[PDB]
Design a binder for these strands. Sequence first.
RNA 1: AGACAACCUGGCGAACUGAAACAUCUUAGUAGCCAGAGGAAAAGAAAGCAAAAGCGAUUCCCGUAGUAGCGGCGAGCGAA
RNA 2: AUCCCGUGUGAAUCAGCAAGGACCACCUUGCAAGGCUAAAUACUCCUGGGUGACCGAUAGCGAAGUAGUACCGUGAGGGA
RNA 3: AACCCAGAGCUAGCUGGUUCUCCCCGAAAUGCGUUGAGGCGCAGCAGUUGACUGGACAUCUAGGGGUAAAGCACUGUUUCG
RNA 4: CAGUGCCGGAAGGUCAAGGAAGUUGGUGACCUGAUGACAGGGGAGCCGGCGACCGAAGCCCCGGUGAACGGCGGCCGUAACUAUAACGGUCCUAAGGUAGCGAAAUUCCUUGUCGGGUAAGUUCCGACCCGCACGAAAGGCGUAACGAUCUGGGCACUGUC
RNA 5: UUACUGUUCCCUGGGAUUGGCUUUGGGCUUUUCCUGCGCAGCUUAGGUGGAAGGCGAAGAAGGCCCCCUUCCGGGGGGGCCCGAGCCAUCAGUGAGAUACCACUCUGGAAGAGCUAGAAUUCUAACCUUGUGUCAGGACCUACGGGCCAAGGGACAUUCUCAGGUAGACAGUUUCUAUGGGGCGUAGGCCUCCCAAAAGGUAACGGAGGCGUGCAAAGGUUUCCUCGGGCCGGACGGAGAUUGGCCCUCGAGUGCAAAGGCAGAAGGGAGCUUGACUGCAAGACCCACCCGUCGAGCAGGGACGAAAGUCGGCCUUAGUGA
RNA 6: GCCCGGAUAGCUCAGUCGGUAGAGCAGGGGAUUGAAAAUCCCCGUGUCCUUGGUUCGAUUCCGAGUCCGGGCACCA
Lengths: 48, 60
Amino acid sequence: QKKVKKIRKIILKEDIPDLGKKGQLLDVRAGFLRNFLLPLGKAEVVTP
Amino acid sequence: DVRVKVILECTGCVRKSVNKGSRGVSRYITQKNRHNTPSRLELRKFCPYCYKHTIHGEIK
RNA sequence: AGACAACCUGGCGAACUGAAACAUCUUAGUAGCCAGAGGAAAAGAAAGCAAAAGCGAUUCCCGUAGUAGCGGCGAGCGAA
RNA sequence: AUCCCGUGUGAAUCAGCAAGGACCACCUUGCAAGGCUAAAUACUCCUGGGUGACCGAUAGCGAAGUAGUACCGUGAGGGA
RNA sequence: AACCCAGAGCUAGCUGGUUCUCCCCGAAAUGCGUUGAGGCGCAGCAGUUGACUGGACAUCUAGGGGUAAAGCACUGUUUCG
RNA sequence: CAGUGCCGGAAGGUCAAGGAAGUUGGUGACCUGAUGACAGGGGAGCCGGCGACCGAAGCCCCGGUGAACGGCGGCCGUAACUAUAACGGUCCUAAGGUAGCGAAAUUCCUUGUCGGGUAAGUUCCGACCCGCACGAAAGGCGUAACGAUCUGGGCACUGUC
RNA sequence: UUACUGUUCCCUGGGAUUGGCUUUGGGCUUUUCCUGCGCAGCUUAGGUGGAAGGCGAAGAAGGCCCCCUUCCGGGGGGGCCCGAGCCAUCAGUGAGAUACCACUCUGGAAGAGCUAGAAUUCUAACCUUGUGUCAGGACCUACGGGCCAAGGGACAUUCUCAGGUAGACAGUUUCUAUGGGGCGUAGGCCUCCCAAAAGGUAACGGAGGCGUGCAAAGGUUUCCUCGGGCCGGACGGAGAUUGGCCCUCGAGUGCAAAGGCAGAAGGGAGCUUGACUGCAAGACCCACCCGUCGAGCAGGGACGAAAGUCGGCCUUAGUGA
RNA sequence: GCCCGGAUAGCUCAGUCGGUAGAGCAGGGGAUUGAAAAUCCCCGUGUCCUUGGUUCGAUUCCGAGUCCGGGCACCA
Ligand SMILES: [Mg+2]
Ligand SMILES: [Mg+2]
Ligand SMILES: [Mg+2]
Ligand SMILES: [Mg+2]
Ligand SMILES: [Mg+2]
Ligand SMILES: [Mg+2]
Ligand SMILES: [Mg+2]
Ligand SMILES: [Mg+2]
Ligand SMILES: [Mg+2]
Ligand SMILES: [Mg+2]
Ligand SMILES: [Mg+2]
Ligand SMILES: [Mg+2]
Ligand SMILES: [Mg+2]
Ligand SMILES: [Mg+2]
Ligand SMILES: [Mg+2]
Ligand SMILES: [Mg+2]
Ligand SMILES: [Mg+2]
Ligand SMILES: [Mg+2]
Ligand SMILES: [Mg+2]
Ligand SMILES: [Mg+2]
Ligand SMILES: [Mg+2]
Ligand SMILES: [Mg+2]
Ligand SMILES: [Mg+2]
Ligand SMILES: [Mg+2]
Ligand SMILES: [Mg+2]
Ligand SMILES: [Mg+2]
Ligand SMILES: [Mg+2]
Ligand SMILES: [Mg+2]
Ligand SMILES: [Mg+2]
Ligand SMILES: [Mg+2]
Ligand SMILES: [Mg+2]
Ligand SMILES: [Mg+2]
Ligand SMILES: [Mg+2]
Ligand SMILES: [Mg+2]
Ligand SMILES: [Mg+2]
Ligand SMILES: [Mg+2]
Ligand SMILES: [Mg+2]
Ligand SMILES: [Mg+2]
Ligand SMILES: [Mg+2]
Ligand SMILES: [Mg+2]
Ligand SMILES: [Mg+2]
Ligand SMILES: [Mg+2]
Ligand SMILES: [Mg+2]
Ligand SMILES: [Mg+2]
Ligand SMILES: [Mg+2]
Ligand SMILES: [Mg+2]
Ligand SMILES: [Mg+2]
Ligand SMILES: [Mg+2]
Ligand SMILES: [Mg+2]
Ligand SMILES: [Mg+2]
Ligand SMILES: [Mg+2]
Ligand SMILES: [Mg+2]
Ligand SMILES: [Mg+2]
Ligand SMILES: [Mg+2]
Ligand SMILES: [Mg+2]
Ligand SMILES: [Mg+2]
Ligand SMILES: [Mg+2]
Ligand SMILES: [Mg+2]
Ligand SMILES: [Mg+2]
Ligand SMILES: [Mg+2]
Ligand SMILES: [Mg+2]
Ligand SMILES: [Mg+2]
Ligand SMILES: [Mg+2]
Ligand SMILES: [Mg+2]
Ligand SMILES: [Mg+2]
Ligand SMILES: [Mg+2]
Ligand SMILES: [Mg+2]
Ligand SMILES: [Mg+2]
Ligand SMILES: [Mg+2]
Ligand SMILES: [Mg+2]
Ligand SMILES: [Mg+2]
Ligand SMILES: [Mg+2]
Ligand SMILES: [Mg+2]
Ligand SMILES: [Mg+2]
Ligand SMILES: [Mg+2]
Ligand SMILES: [Mg+2]
Ligand SMILES: [Mg+2]
Ligand SMILES: [Mg+2]
Ligand SMILES: [Mg+2]
Ligand SMILES: [Mg+2]
Ligand SMILES: [Mg+2]
Ligand SMILES: [Mg+2]
Ligand SMILES: [Mg+2]
Ligand SMILES: [Mg+2]
Ligand SMILES: [Mg+2]
Ligand SMILES: [Mg+2]
Ligand SMILES: [Mg+2]
Ligand SMILES: [Mg+2]
Ligand SMILES: [Mg+2]
Ligand SMILES: [Mg+2]
Ligand SMILES: [Mg+2]
Ligand SMILES: [Mg+2]
Ligand SMILES: [Mg+2]
Ligand SMILES: [Mg+2]
Ligand SMILES: [Mg+2]
Ligand SMILES: [Mg+2]
Ligand SMILES: [Mg+2]
Ligand SMILES: [Mg+2]
Ligand SMILES: [Mg+2]
Ligand SMILES: [Mg+2]
Ligand SMILES: [Mg+2]
Ligand SMILES: [Mg+2]
Ligand SMILES: [Mg+2]
Ligand SMILES: [Mg+2]
Ligand SMILES: [Mg+2]
Ligand SMILES: [Mg+2]
Ligand SMILES: [Mg+2]
Ligand SMILES: [Zn+2]
């Protein structure tokens, strides 16, 4: 139906450009999170 | 075409569902020549509900 | 692991035929084919029926009933 | 409506949720997204008994003798 | 548009066939409709079963009609004067 | 280059699913009406209909393309004798059959007419054109060689007669 | 095959796989600013409210000029110069002061916000390659596995939904009578003839028509007579309007034909809506389905003084389960 | 059946954000030109579809009626 932007709330474990310092809270698109951030150890997906 | 089916309708009939014995909106039907007589036809005719001869006009 | 008449479960799945033609519908989820297991299989312990009164898993027979319905409201199909 | 599936979105936990033939209120009934289970029922390649207003060699099984034989067909198959 | 088996005893408003005896009664080939015309439905005319009935075959009278004949009053047509 | 196809074009019209402002209905905590055995209005929520505007290709639109599909006309009138018509008028189409061939595997009427071949020729060869209804890559017109080809004639030869 | 209904190849949009940064930009906004010729006039009257207070040295009236909108009437506004005023019921006006202030409307501006669309990148999804390189007992220049690299890259592919689209493919339909060929014609209803003096009746036998029309061409009350000869009369003639005598039904009747119809069903005038609701004994026609006639009753009317007539039309075509 | 847009001079269409009704051809006139045409200029005509409403008054805004031009549909 109507495309619904997927929002994954995450914590950055390292500093990456356009995102921010290590130990940082954000929200991201799911493709960005799983295809890029997650395989490189850079981010962590958070549901406390 | 130039000869048309027209509905005559009682003017003093109230579609609100009246409280009398028999409730309904009288309509007759007949034909007119829409060219010859462009004036909306008016006719005095009987209405089963009102029980008197009423005036029936037209509908669009 | 293979074999195994019919029955059974799952998967694929027709057409002639009927409709006095035919296309929706019918034939029929039938035949066939593949796979699977049993002496039976499947279903089965209410997220169910019912109606203001009640029932108490599933399956099968009688009946309700050719009733309610479904249907180019045609041919026909047909419950609880 | 109920039931079950492709693509996509996507809840609520008993102060809930589903069903009651669109839908909403109210009441009644029930507790989905984990499994397993005997009997009553279907069937005859058969085994053991029994019966037959069943056949009696053109019948009864295709076959009362080499019968799935002889023979025919490349083969599936036909077949006395 | 191969062959063999199966659905399959497909379907055929078409053609062919459909076996003992006696007794009684006994048609139709017409109308309408039909994707109908060599089919079928209903009617018409069989048989058998009941319920009412009183007719039929003759005889005479009465109705309305516009044919045969006939005619030129109309409608056409036509010859000569 | 009108019709049809094919290719290219991008301004306008048309243009689905899907989005979507916004309206609209059913229910209803409630609020009133009412000498009839009830009725009218209604929040939130849930449920339903409608829906301006956004919305591609394609189509309509514009252009090219015949060794793409195919198509290639009528009617009059006129030259010192009859005749015929180089010449003009008009009609209609997208345009009106050019070169070459022509009674042909195409010609109906038809055994066309003429010439030749025969004592005699509906076939044959050459030519005329009045092409019912030839024609240019469904090729047109020629052509040496070739053919158990089709078709006419001649010498040799024979029981084909 | 340009018969019907579809299927597929193929093209194009949403969704999904599917991400980052940047632009450009169509429609809504978030503070906030621009902007309005009913007339009476200090004059291009913004509606509604707080409403005797506001705007000034964080520096106004008044002239010197820059800009922009423009109905060149004038409006907002930057610089400078200037230095103590622009003011309110002050009277008009449906609505008040440009003293000020709040949500905002006509259109404009701007930084900020949502969604595309679009274009550009980037690399990590995804795609494509490699006699590049490892690898087990030994090989894998034997397909392949892991790593690296190289080229593409959020396109494409795959999936789903939607529109378009090939007789490429599938199922099917294509009437009857013509002359038992093409071809066009015919297929229902009405009138006449054939049709044999009830009714009925065939032929690819002979003639024609209909698929409606009228708000009056219906209803009613009441009055009227057409047509054709002959004669007179200005244009006016064979023929227009007018007068008169003779024949008497030969005209007319929305349209075919037949049957009707003369103080009439024909022509005119007045008032009307019965071109109604509820029905209905009984008949005719009849295979069925349909179809036709209707005395009579009630309601409520129209015309008429009343008696009475009126449930469309002189009748029969004008229709469809 | 719905959805848009129109009716303005003889013909074809421009339209203030209500205060004048307008363009381009068809026509008339003048020479252009010895004559044709270009070339050029002048002049004529209007119930702004019909009706009501709004307004100090309307082509202008709105309602109803009528016609016209197109766009999109559906199982008697
Ligand atoms: Mg998503
Ligand atoms: Mg096994
Ligand atoms: Mg096996
Ligand atoms: Mg076993
Ligand atoms: Mg079938
Ligand atoms: Mg079939
Ligand atoms: Mg059949
Ligand atoms: Mg049949
Ligand atoms: Mg058992
Ligand atoms: Mg079990
Ligand atoms: Mg229990
Ligand atoms: Mg349990
Ligand atoms: Mg349930
Ligand atoms: Mg139930
Ligand atoms: Mg449910
Ligand atoms: Mg399923
Ligand atoms: Mg939960
Ligand atoms: Mg329950
Ligand atoms: Mg549970
Ligand atoms: Mg469930
Ligand atoms: Mg359970
Ligand atoms: Mg089980
Ligand atoms: Mg023997
Ligand atoms: Mg035997
Ligand atoms: Mg014997
Ligand atoms: Mg072949
Ligand atoms: Mg065969
Ligand atoms: Mg069968
Ligand atoms: Mg059979
Ligand atoms: Mg057989
Ligand atoms: Mg058959
Ligand atoms: Mg006898
Ligand atoms: Mg006889
Ligand atoms: Mg037959
Ligand atoms: Mg019979
Ligand atoms: Mg009898
Ligand atoms: Mg007599
Ligand atoms: Mg007599
Ligand atoms: Mg007589
Ligand atoms: Mg007679
Ligand atoms: Mg006679
Ligand atoms: Mg006579
Ligand atoms: Mg005579
Ligand atoms: Mg062309
Ligand atoms: Mg072309
Ligand atoms: Mg072209
Ligand atoms: Mg194109
Ligand atoms: Mg365009
Ligand atoms: Mg659109
Ligand atoms: Mg939509
Ligand atoms: Mg909405
Ligand atoms: Mg509501
Ligand atoms: Mg209520
Ligand atoms: Mg309510
Ligand atoms: Mg659009
Ligand atoms: Mg487009
Ligand atoms: Mg051109
Ligand atoms: Mg050529
Ligand atoms: Mg001469
Ligand atoms: Mg010429
Ligand atoms: Mg010429
Ligand atoms: Mg000329
Ligand atoms: Mg032309
Ligand atoms: Mg051309
Ligand atoms: Mg030309
Ligand atoms: Mg030539
Ligand atoms: Mg030449
Ligand atoms: Mg020559
Ligand atoms: Mg010859
Ligand atoms: Mg040739
Ligand atoms: Mg020829
Ligand atoms: Mg010949
Ligand atoms: Mg000679
Ligand atoms: Mg000769
Ligand atoms: Mg010869
Ligand atoms: Mg020759
Ligand atoms: Mg030719
Ligand atoms: Mg040729
Ligand atoms: Mg050619
Ligand atoms: Mg050749
Ligand atoms: Mg040669
Ligand atoms: Mg050879
Ligand atoms: Mg010699
Ligand atoms: Mg001999
Ligand atoms: Mg796609
Ligand atoms: Mg995507
Ligand atoms: Mg790369
Ligand atoms: Mg390798
Ligand atoms: Mg490798
Ligand atoms: Mg790159
Ligand atoms: Mg993609
Ligand atoms: Mg499709
Ligand atoms: Mg086919
Ligand atoms: Mg098709
Ligand atoms: Mg008789
Ligand atoms: Mg008779
Ligand atoms: Mg007859
Ligand atoms: Mg009258
Ligand atoms: Mg006179
Ligand atoms: Mg007549
Ligand atoms: Mg008469
Ligand atoms: Mg009269
Ligand atoms: Mg009476
Ligand atoms: Mg009566
Ligand atoms: Mg009465
Ligand atoms: Mg009176
Ligand atoms: Mg009359
Ligand atoms: Zn009434």
